[PDB]
């Protein structure tokens, strides 16, 4: 695939798996079984009948916002060999192919340097896109938007912490009753 | 600020295409009514009063409006052409070539069946189309 | 026109209902897109609406069942609060008697 | 030669009784598929059926039961025990006088062997999954957990308290089919009831309706060896001989009147 | 009835989309109707639905009956 | 002895956790396990000596077993000592790796140090009787039996019909066939026949029985698999378990005129028969469809190592006139 | 306050028991009705599944409250792996479409609906599943009390085992 | 402190390591019941959030709340363990936990492995077996 500074406007006709191309690009960031459309075995992630699912991503840092240009090379070669068995091999090369890293955690570091899938608004599946654009009425539009704004998840963790604070209050009550009993014995032993 | 800027960007995109309105974001009912006053319409009626292609474009504009204030420098989109219109696809490509051309920060993984990236006006600076070898 | 007698659509809707026919209901009439929606419909809701396509008396029965469940939860929390209140009041009244 | 001669005479009595063989056949079939206790009535019933088919007059029931017990000891080192009646629980080996009957495994440990079994099953589970043996193993495991619960509950814990403790260990009280077992815990409970592992107590308090607690059922109780229980707990926490008698008495406390001792 | 309930008979369409006139002598037994569109088979379904108190939006090809 | 008696007890107990069927070598490991529990171990014995006393105990056992209408037989697994021991040392590797956490004793070191001599033998305590309590297995209802018997019949049919085509090298059976062929002849590129047969197919027809819901079906299958009555191929096919075999071995032998091995004269449902149809032709003196002569895999190996490479029923070029048997 | 509580408690308990009795009667009504519903629906649809020569079941789920109850599908063809649930996650759409076909067949089996119409749903389906749909129509002709059947297809395939009660059509457009 | 990607991601990283260390103190408390872990994790997360003050990415708030919930449970459990020097409730988890070797709240593999093994090793019920000859008819 040919890309660069310009975005990933994949012009993929029928038979190329345009949605499948999107899923492969997403799996370039470590999708799971329910977000890969390939199941337990990774053979179909590779070409059907192939083994070496090569994700090669030369990432040049000769522009604004360079990540370790003198360390990770001006270019960065993300090499994800997704295979039929075992964990997929990784190699984060420099411009000259010098493998600076061999894991996607440094990819995570680079992305956090760039913010460049977790948010539904970030990445939308075929089912998710269909629900957003056709199966979304005002209530469903609201749910889709709040999830994309994470506002749904925001309030989720909000009231989750609220619930654990209620738990904390219950602990306050019980442990304070225990403290009252202990201090009552304390004062009685004083007198 | 997100709701405000989302309504503003929705109105701006509709004006670029032609339109204006408000978002009834009823938290209690968890319902986002979208009452948009359009030239194609009469009053600030809901987007459900618009055409299917018009409703799809309105949803796309609202989604980009949602993207606008979010701290996301990466977005994706696929499998939308099946339940949309080619006019909407072309207008979206124009919106990308007029907005994402200067958005050198957000990585947009947008997937289209046709080679509309180079057929239509979506290539520009910042982030835009790049060659995908058709099968 | 029923037997070539001009009427509105309501009488024909009554006829369709009385003919055991539903050109709207997916259980009797749906499209491929409606088929896939069916393939994504809420199992709870989809089953319920199929039942409605068979029986809705039991549907309202279930609805009242859930409503009574909610009433039960409300009244149950009320009973718990009443029990705790009774016990606390008994203890406090003992204290008042002592005073 | 004690075993040889004894088994020889056993074989002789067999010449007087193939009935015992068929009996244990049914015994072990019923158990293996069911893990079951059997009633005195059922015993004598099948006995009379056999006596008719054998066309031989019925000998002593006590005779028969003792004979087969000895059989399956010399062949199996086990004891057939009958149970005292449930009426004796809420209001010399009786044998022929006892009512409910099962088989008991009469050997001590062979420590290294049980641990090596632990090891084999460790290979098993680690390979297993992100079953009927293992299915029942989980079934019994939850059982044992609950047993411990009741023991810290001094042979008395209500329904809902138990329910909470189940949630305490991540058990879905939602009513879903049990993971791996595809059933409801309620059905498990009804099993322990029929498998006499538990006691369900329902009392009509006029304020709160029927309140239900539970106690240890005599299947477990006869099952539950004291030292077995104790060293079991030691192995739960990987304990040395130091806290032996101290936790022994702590367990005595946890028991109380748990057993009709 | 002698036939199964709701047995359809020949349906006459007139001045419909392109069909100035046509009549289909239908079948009470079975209908393995195979063939793509081009004259409005989906439009034929819309005609059948709308002519029997059915909203055309069940499929959504054309809405206004007139 | 009482020591030996209780030994044999514990053996059978394992057998119950073995649910009635136990490996030769696994039994050996249990022996060493027991001798560590008994602390009576005398290091000076070759594995053979342990085997000796094992079998002495075995005989005492089966003496009483025969008293009981139940009995343990020792057989050799048809996939053969080598393939058996390959899969078993794949787990003896998982075993010694797991025991290194427990290898705090020289006994455990000796255990991991004793590389298991290759052996495919198992011992099985099996019914010898058919009477009321017998049918009173109480395992489950009647349909489950009848249908399972039907599936067994299906597998019998599958075994009888020879399928021609390339050998499934995915089957390790073929791999070891070729390995033996190379070991004996040294012909690294010897031509393989395309004639083969097996029973394992029919899982598709498990789902072709229509008298019960699919759920119950699957679940019963899971029982069996746990109960190791049938077995799952990684291709999804199912055969019937070796011990389960010995049971039905004798019954089916009666029911279907089942020819045994030629050297050990035991029925084997896997091995090598003659691909010459004249060897599988009916022996016209009997009028019975005479399935082609087939040895146990070890029996075939010994025969070819010592007797011939030609059939005896037909004499054919067993190098080319063979059939793989799965 | 205690007087108020003790006055309300008998009334509240009475209402709770009225509830409980109503719930019990509702169970005793629906649960057997739903039992027949699901049982015979699944029987018909799965017998058709086997007529296809394919693995597929539809299970009813009844958690503690009726609001939690539902219906699911669990199918299998790939013998290499055991059966699992059939949903809209990863399976082929044609399998789900055929499942819906059997769904409407069982609906005819149960509902008063005396005839069948299939409106070109087979769009995008492969050869195998469309042949399966055709054979489903055949079995519709193979059932008793021959009603009116309609199925709209764009094309037709070979190897169509036919019978007498059926009537093959051809939509021209 | 309003929008530095480095600050946000380092907060993420410190919090993830904090999660790992809190899982360690999870087992520590399960065996013992220490409150210092809870309080110190509270202080750590609060300090990091103080650094996040002015930074406004949702995920940080979500994960911080996760930390909050975990720490609150830590403190409550430690207090319960502090009040007196139950034990089975401690033990069964420990039994479950010690049957939790894993690499280092659903139901684990060797959880049930150990439990069933224990019962077998100890059951006074003798094991049982079955067969098919006779059901084979
Ligand atoms: Zn021959």
Gap from CA of F251 to ligand 1 centroid (Å): 26
DSSP letter at D172? Answer: -
Distance between CA atoms of residues F219 and H9, nearest Å? 49
Query: To 10 degrees, what angle do helices A151-190 and A138-148 make?
Result: 70
Residues 6+ apart with CB under 8 A from F133: D22, D23, D25, D26, D29, H134
Distance F75 CA to ligand 1 centre (A): 26
10 Å CB burial of residue A18 (0-12, 13-18, 19+) is buried
Tell me which residue of A40, F147, F151 sits closest to G80, measured CA to CA: A40
- D·F CB contacts under 8 A: 88
Give the C-alpha separation, A133 to B80, whole Å.
8
* DSSP strand pairing (F121-127 vs F70-76): antiparallel
Name the residue among G16, G37, G65 with its Cβ closest to that of C75. Answer: G16
Binding-site positions of A: 12-19
Q: Are A162 and B109 contacting, i.e. CB atoms less than 8 angstroms apart?
A: no
- Residue D27 and residue F137 in contact, taking contact as beta carbons nearer than 8 Å: no
**Half-sphere exposure for C34 (CA within 13 Å, toward CB):** 19
- The alpha-carbon gap from G131 to the nearest alpha carbon of chain C, in Å, equals 17
- The DSSP code for B83 is G
Q: Which of F14, F238, F271, F210 is nearest to F123 (CA)?
A: F14
Q: Do chains B and D touch (3 or more CB pairs under 8 A)?
A: no
- D35, H128: Cβ pair inside 8 Å? yes
Residues F62 and F235: beta-carbon distance below 8 Å: no
Beta pairing partners, E14:
E21
CB pair distance less than 8 Å for C9 and E53: yes
User: Strand order of the sheet with strand D100-105?
Assistant: D38-39, D100-105, D78-83
CA–CA separation, A120 and B70 (whole Å): 12
CA F45 to chain centroid: 28
The count of C-alpha atoms lying within 13 angstroms of the C-alpha of F21, restricted to the half-sphere facing its C-beta, is: 20
E59 to chain G: closest CA residue: G119
Burial G60-98 (b: 16+ CB within 10 A, else e): bebeeebbebbbebbbbbebeeebeebeeeebebbbbbb
Sign of CA dihedral F316, F319, F321, F325: positive
Q: What SS3 state is found at G76?
A: strand
Between CA D7 and CA C83 the distance in angstroms is 68
CB contact under 8 Å between F13 and H133, yes or no, is no
Q: Taking CB atoms and an 8 Å cutoff, what residues of chain H touch B71? A: 56-58
What does the CA dihedral G13, G14, G17, G19 come to, rounded to 10 degrees?
A: -100
D37 φ/ψ sector (left φ>0, alpha ψ -120 to 50, else beta)? beta
Q: What phi, psi does D39 have (nearest 5°)?
A: -90, 150
Find, among F282, F245, F279, the residue nearest to F262 by Cα: F279
Q: How far is CA D237 from CA A7, D175, G27, H121, in A?
A: 59, 32, 47, 16
Rounded distance between C-alpha atoms, residue B106 and residue A116, angstroms: 6
D15-36 burial, b at 16+ Cβ within 10 Å, e below that, comes to eebebbbbbbbbbbbbbbeebb
Q: G115-118 and G148-151: which strand pairing?
A: parallel
Q: Which of A28, A25, A32 is nearest to A90 (CA)?
A: A28
- Given CA atoms G47, G50, G52, G54 in this order, what sign does their dihedral have? positive
Q: Which residue of chain H has the CA closest to B73?
A: H5
Phi–psi pair at A57, nearest 5 degrees:
-135, 95
In this complex, the residue of E6, E34, E37 whose CB is nearest that of residue G156 is: E34
* Residue E10 labelled as part of a binding site: no
H or E segment and range at residue F246: helix F242-256
Which is nearest to F45 in space by CA: F99, F100, F105, F110? F110
* Contact between F207 and G78 using a beta-carbon 8 Å cutoff: no
C31 touches E at CB < 8 Å:
yes
| Closest CA of chain E from C23, distance in Å | 6
The Cα–Cα gap between C96 and F198 comes to 89
Cβ atoms A132, A144 nearer than 8 A = yes
- The answer to whether B56 faces chain A, any CB pair under 8 Å, is yes
Residues from chain G contacting residue D176 (CB–CB below 8 Å)? 63
Strand pairing class (B20-26; D198-205): unpaired
CB distance E62 to E43 below 8 Å: yes
Chain H contact for F149, CB < 8 A?
yes
List of chain B residues whose C-beta atoms are within 8 Å of the C-beta of residue H57: 71
Q: How far is the CA of F281 from the centre of ligand 1 (A)?
A: 8
Pairing of strands F195-197, F322-325: parallel
Chains E and F physically touch (3 or more Cβ atom pairs below 8 Å): no
* DSSP count for chain C of H helices, then E strands: 4, 0
Query: Which residues, 6 or more positions from F239, have their beta carbon under 8 angstroms from its beta carbon?
Result: F155, F198, F199, F200, F230, F231, F233, F269, F326
Cα–Cα nearest to F8, from F30, F40, F36: F30
For chain H, the farthest-separated pair of C-alpha atoms sits apart, in whole angstroms, at 82
CA–centroid distance, residue A50 to ligand 1 (Å) = 44
Strands, E assignment, D117-224: 157-158, 198-205, 209-216
Helix (H, G, I), strand (E, B) or coil at A169: helix
List all residues 6 or more positions away from A113 whose beta carbon is below 8 Å from its beta carbon. Answer: A65, A67, H5, H6, H9
| Least Cα separation, residue E42 to chain G (angstroms) | 8
Q: For the purposes of burial, counting CB atoms within 10 Å of the CB of F132, is it exposed (0-12), middle (13-18) or buried (19 or more)?
A: middle
* Measured distance CA(D85)–CA(D250) in Å, rounded: 30
Q: Positive or negative CA dihedral for D6, D12, D16, D19?
A: positive
Distance F185 CA to ligand 1 centre (A): 21
Do the Cβ atoms of F263 and F303 come closer than 8 Å?
A: yes
Q: Over the Cα atoms of chain H, what is R_g?
A: 23
Q: How far apart are CA D76 and CA D71, in angstroms?
A: 8
Distance CA G140, CA G107 (A): 13
How far, in Å, is the centroid of ligand 1 from the Cα of F264? Answer: 18
- For B130, C88, F147, F228, F238, the CA distances from F207, given in Å and listed in that order, are 50, 64, 11, 19, 12
SS3 breakdown of chain H: % helix, strand, coil, rounded to 5?
A: 70, 0, 30
Using CB atoms, which residue from D28, D106, D237 is nearest to H94? D237
Q: Do A5 and B104 touch (CB under 8 A)?
A: yes
Question: Would you say E14 and G148 are in contact if contact means Cβ atoms under 8 Å apart?
Answer: no
CA–CA gap between residue B115 and residue B117 (Å, rounded): 5
Q: Is C19 on the interface with E (CB under 8 A)?
A: yes
* Residues A76 and A61 sit within 8 Å (Cβ to Cβ): yes
CA of F194 to the centre of ligand 1 (A): 17
Going from the Cα of F300 to the center of ligand 1, the distance in angstroms, rounded, reads 14
Q: Exposed, middle or buried by CB within 10 Å (0-12, 13-18, 19+), for F72?
A: buried
Q: What torsion do the CA atoms of A97, A99, A103, A108 make, to the nearest 10 degrees?
A: -70
Task: Give the Å distances, CA to CA, from C98 to A188, C94, G80.
Answer: 19, 6, 79
Instruction: Say whether E37 counts as a known binding-site residue.
Output: yes
User: In chain D, whose CA is at the least distance from the CA of H128?
Assistant: D32
Q: From the CB of residue B116, how many other CB atoms can be counted at a distance below 10 Å? A: 19
Angle between helix axes G127-142 and G2-52 (nearest 10 degrees) is 100
Which residues does chain H have within 8 Å of residue F22's beta carbon, measured at their own beta carbons?
none
Task: Report whether G138 contacts G162 (CB < 8 A).
Answer: yes
Q: What angle do CA D189, D190, D193 make, to 5 degrees?
A: 90
Any G CB within 8 A of D208 CB: no
**Cross-chain residue pair C66–G66, CB shorter than 8 Å:** yes
Question: How far apart are alpha carbons G77 and G55 in whole angstroms?
Answer: 6
Rounded Cα gap, residues G114 and G146, in angstroms: 10
Is H129:D28 a contact under the CB 8 Å cutoff? yes
Distance from the G161 Cα atom to the nearest Cα atom in chain D, whole angstroms: 41
Neighbours of chain G (3+ CB pairs under 8 A): A, C, D, E, F
The C-alpha atoms of residue B132 and residue C11 are separated, in whole angstroms, by 58
Number of Cβ within 10 Å of residue F253's Cβ equals: 13
Alpha carbons H38 and H79: distance in angstroms, whole number: 10
Cα–Cα distance, F291 to F279 (Å, whole number): 7
**Local structure of C4: helix, strand or coil:** coil
C-alpha–C-alpha distance, residues G27 and F64, integer Å: 57
What's the rounded Cα separation, in Å, for the pair F58 and F36?
20
Q: Is C5 exposed, middle or buried (0-12, 13-18, 19+ CB in 10 A)?
A: exposed
Q: With contact defined as beta carbons under 8 Å apart, do H89 and D152 qualify?
A: yes
E39: annotated binding-site residue? yes
Q: How far apart are CA F51 and CA D184, in angstroms?
A: 48
G83: chain D residues, CB-CB within 8 Å: none
Chains A and H share 3 or more Cβ pairs within 8 Å: yes
Q: Which residues of B touch A8 (CB under 8 A)?
A: 107-110, 130
**What is the helix, strand, coil percentage profile of chain G, to 5?**
50, 15, 35
Q: Check: CB of residue D101 under 8 Å from CB of residue D40.
A: yes
Tell me, yes or no, whether chains D and E touch by having 3 or more C-beta pairs under 8 A.
no
Residue E2 marked as a ligand binder? no
Residues 6+ apart with CB under 8 A from H32: H81
Asked if C20 and E59 come within 8 Å (Cβ–Cβ), the reply is no
CA distances from G47 to D82, F137, F149, G83, H46 (A): 50, 31, 22, 17, 63
- Partners of A145 on chain H (C-beta within 8 Å) are none
Q: What is the DSSP letter of F288?
A: B
CB D119 within 8 A of CB F98: yes
CA G29 vs. chain centroid, Å, equals 21
Helix (H) or strand (E) holding B35: strand B31-37
Cα separation, E34 vs E18, in Å, equals 21
Q: At what resolution in Å was this solved?
A: 8.0
Distance from CA of G144 to the nearest CA of F (A): 20
Flag whether residue D108 sits within 8 Å of chain G, measured between CB atoms: no
Distance of CA A173 to the CA centre of its chain: 40
Taking CA–CA distances from D176, the nearest residue in chain G reads G63
Strands A89-93 and A99-101: antiparallel
**CA nearest F126: which of F77, F66, F78?**
F66
* In contact, E50 and E60? CB cutoff 8 Å: no
Q: How many CA atoms lie within 13 A of A147 on its CB side?
A: 18
Distance CA D233, CA D245 (A): 12
Rounded CA separation A137/F250 (Å)? 69
């Amino acid at each position: 695939l040919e890309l660069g500074s310009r975005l990933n406007f994949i012009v993929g006709n029928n038979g190329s798996g345009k949605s499948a191309i999107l899923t492969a690009i997403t799996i370039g960031l470590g999708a799971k079984a329910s977000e890969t459309n390939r199941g337990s075995s990774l053979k179909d992630l590779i070409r059907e009948g192939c083994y070496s699912a090569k994700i090669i991503l030369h990432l040049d840092n000769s522009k604004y916002g360079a990540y370790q240009q003198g360390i990770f090379g001006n270019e960065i070669i993300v090499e994800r060999i997704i295979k039929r068995d075992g964990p997929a091999s990784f190699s984060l090369r420099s411009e000259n192919g010098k493998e600076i890293s061999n894991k996607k955690k440094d990819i995570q570091t680079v992305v956090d340097y760039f913010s460049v899938v977790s948010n539904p608004m970030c990445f939308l599946s075929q089912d998710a896109a269909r629900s957003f654009l056709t199966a979304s009425t005002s209530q469903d539009k609201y749910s889709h938007f709040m999830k994309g704004t994470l506002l749904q998840e925001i309030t989720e963790n909000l009231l989750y912490a609220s619930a654990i604070h209620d738990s904390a209050q219950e602990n306050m009550a019980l442990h304070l009753e225990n403290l009252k009993s202990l201090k009552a014995e304390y004062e009685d032993a004083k007198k | 600020g997100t709701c405000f800027d989302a309504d503003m960007d929705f109105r701006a995109s509709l004006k670029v295409r032609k339109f204006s309105g408000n978002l009834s974001f009823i938290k209690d009912t968890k319902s986002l009514e979208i009452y948009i006053l359009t030239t194609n319409d009469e009053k600030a009626r809901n987007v459900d009063t618009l055409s299917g292609g018009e409703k799809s474009f309105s949803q796309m504009a609202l989604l980009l409006a949602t993207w606008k204030p979010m701290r996301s420098r990466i977005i994706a989109l696929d499998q939308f052409d099946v339940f949309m219109d080619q006019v909407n696809r072309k207008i979206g490509t124009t919106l990308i070539v007029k907005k994402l051309k200067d958005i050198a920060r957000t990585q947009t993984i947008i997937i289209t069946p046709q080679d509309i990236g180079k057929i239509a006006d979506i290539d520009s600076s910042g982030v835009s189309i790049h060659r995908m070898r058709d099968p | 026109l029923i037997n070539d007698y001009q009427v509105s659509e309501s009488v024909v809707k009554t006829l369709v209902a009385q003919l055991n026919i539903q050109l709207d209901n997916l259980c009797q009439f749906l499209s491929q897109e409606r088929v896939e929606e069916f393939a994504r419909l809420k199992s709870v809701k989809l089953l319920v609406e199929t039942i409605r396509s068979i029986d809705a008396s039991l549907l309202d029965v279930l609805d009242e069942l859930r409503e009574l469940q909610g009433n039960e939860q409300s009244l149950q929390k009320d009973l718990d609060f009443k029990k705790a209140k009774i016990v606390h009041l008994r203890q406090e009244s003992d204290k008042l008697r002592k005073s | 030669d004690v075993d040889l001669t004894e088994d020889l005479a056993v074989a002789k009595i067999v010449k007087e009784n193939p009935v015992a063989r068929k009996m244990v056949r049914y015994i072990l079939s019923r158990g293996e598929s069911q893990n079951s206790i059997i009633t005195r009535n059922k015993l004598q019933s099948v006995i009379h059926e056999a006596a008719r088919e054998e066309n031989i007059a019925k000998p002593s029931f006590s005779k028969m039961f003792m004979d087969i017990n000895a059989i399956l000891y010399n062949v199996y080192g086990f004891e057939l025990q009958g149970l005292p009646s449930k009426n004796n629980m809420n209001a010399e080996p009786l044998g022929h006088r006892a009512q409910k009957f099962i088989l008991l495994n009469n050997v001590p440990h062979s420590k290294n062997f049980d641990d090596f079994k632990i090891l084999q099953s460790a290979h098993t589970y680690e390979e297993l999954i992100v079953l009927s043996t293992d299915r029942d193993l989980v079934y019994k495991g939850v059982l044992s957990v609950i047993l411990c619960i009741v023991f810290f509950s001094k042979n008395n814990i209500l329904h809902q308290e138990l329910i909470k403790f189940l949630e305490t260990f991540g058990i879905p009280s939602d009513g879903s089919k049990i993971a791996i077992l595809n059933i409801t815990i309620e059905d498990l409970i009804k099993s322990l009831e029929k498998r006499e592992y538990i006691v369900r107590l329902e009392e009509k308090s006029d304020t709160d309706g029927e309140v239900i607690s539970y106690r240890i059922g005599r299947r477990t109780q006869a099952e539950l060896g004291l030292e077995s229980l104790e060293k079991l707990v030691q192995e739960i926490m990987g304990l040395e001989k130091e806290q032996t008698k101290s936790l022994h008495d702590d367990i005595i406390k946890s028991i109380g009147d748990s057993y009709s001792i | 009835s002698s036939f199964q309930p709701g047995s359809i008979i020949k349906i006459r369409l007139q001045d419909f989309v392109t069909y100035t006139l046509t009549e289909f002598n239908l079948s009470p037994s079975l209908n393995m109707i195979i063939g793509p569109n081009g004259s409005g088979k989906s439009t034929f379904v819309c005609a059948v639905c709308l002519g029997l108190a059915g909203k055309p939006e069940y499929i959504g090809r054309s809405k206004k009956v007139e | 002895p009482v020591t030996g008696d209780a030994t044999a007890k514990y053996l059978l107990q394992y057998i119950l956790s073995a649910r009635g069927i136990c490996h030769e070598n696994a039994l050996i490991l249990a022996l060493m396990r027991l001798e560590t529990d008994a602390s009576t171990l005398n290091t000076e014995w070759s594995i053979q000596q342990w085997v000796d006393k094992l079998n002495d105990y075995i005989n005492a056992i089966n003496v009483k077993l025969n008293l009981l209408g139940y009995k343990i037989i020792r057989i050799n697994h048809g996939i053969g000592r080598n393939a058996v021991t390959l899969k078993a040392k794949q787990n003896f590797e998982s075993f010694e790796d797991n025991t290194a956490i427990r290898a705090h004793n020289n006994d455990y070191a000796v255990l991991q140090s004793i590389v298991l001599p290759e052996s495919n033998r198992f011992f099985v305590y099996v019914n010898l009787a058919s009477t009321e309590e017998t049918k009173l297995a109480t395992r489950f209802n009647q349909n489950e039996i009848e249908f399972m018997k039907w599936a067994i019949e299906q597998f019998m049919i599958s075994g009888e019909t020879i399928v021609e085509g390339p050998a499934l090298e995915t089957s390790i059976i073929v791999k070891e066939v070729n390995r033996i062929l190379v070991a004996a002849t040294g012909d690294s590129n010897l031509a393989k026949w395309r004639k083969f047969s097996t029973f394992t197919v029919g899982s598709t027809n498990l789902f072709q029985f229509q008298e019960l819901t699919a759920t119950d079906i699957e679940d019963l299958l899971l029982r069996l698999c746990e109960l190791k009555w049938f077995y799952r191929t990684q291709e999804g096919k199912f055969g019937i378990d070796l011990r389960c075999i010995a049971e039905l071995e004798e019954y089916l032998t009666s029911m279907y005129n089942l020819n045994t091995c030629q050297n050990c004269h035991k029925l084997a449902i896997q091995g090598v028969r003659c691909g010459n149809e004249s060897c599988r032709e009916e022996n016209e003196e009997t009028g019975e469809n005479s399935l082609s002569q087939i040895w146990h895999v070890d029996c075939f190996k010994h025969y070819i190592t010592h007797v011939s490479k030609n059939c005896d029923r037909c004499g054919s070029s067993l190098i080319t006139e063979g059939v793989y048997v799965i | 306050e205690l007087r108020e509580l003790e006055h309300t408690v008998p009334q509240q308990s009475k209402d709770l028991e009225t509830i409980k009795a109503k719930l019990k009667e509702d169970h005793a009504v629906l649960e057997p009705k739903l039992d027949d519903i699901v049982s015979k629906i699944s029987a018909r649809f799965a017998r058709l599944f086997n007529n296809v020569g394919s693995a597929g079941a539809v299970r009813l789920e009844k958690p503690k409250d009726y609001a939690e109850w539902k219906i699911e599908i669990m199918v299998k063809f790939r013998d290499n792996a055991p059966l699992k649930k059939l949903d809209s996650h990863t399976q082929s759409g044609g399998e789900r479409a055929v499942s819906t076909v059997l769904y409407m067949i069982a609906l005819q089996e149960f509902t008063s609906a005396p005839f069948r119409v299939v409106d070109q749903i087979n769009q995008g389906m492969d050869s195998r599943n469309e042949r399966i749909v055709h054979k489903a129509m055949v079995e519709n002709a193979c059932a008793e009390n021959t009603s009116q059947y309609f199925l709209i297809t764009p094309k037709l395939l070979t190897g169509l085992h036919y019978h007498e009660k059926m009537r093959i059509h051809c939509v021209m457009a | 402190k309003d929008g530095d990607p480095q600050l946000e991601f380092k907060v993420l990283q410190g919090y993830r390591d904090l999660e790992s260390e809190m899982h360690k103190g999870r087992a520590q408390v399960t065996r013992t019941g220490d409150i210092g872990v809870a309080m110190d994790n509270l202080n750590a997360v609060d300090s990091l959030f103080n650094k996040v003050i002015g930074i406004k990415n949702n995920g940080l708030f979500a994960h911080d709340a996760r930390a909050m919930v975990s720490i609150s449970e830590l403190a409550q459990i430690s207090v319960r363990n502090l009040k007196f020097d139950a034990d089975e409730q401690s033990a069964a988890d420990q039994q479950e936990e010690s049957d939790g070797d894993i690499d280092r709240n659903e139901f684990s593999q060797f959880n049930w492995f150990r439990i069933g093994a224990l019962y077998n090793t100890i059951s006074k019920n003798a094991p049982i077996t079955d067969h098919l000859m006779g059901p084979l008819s």
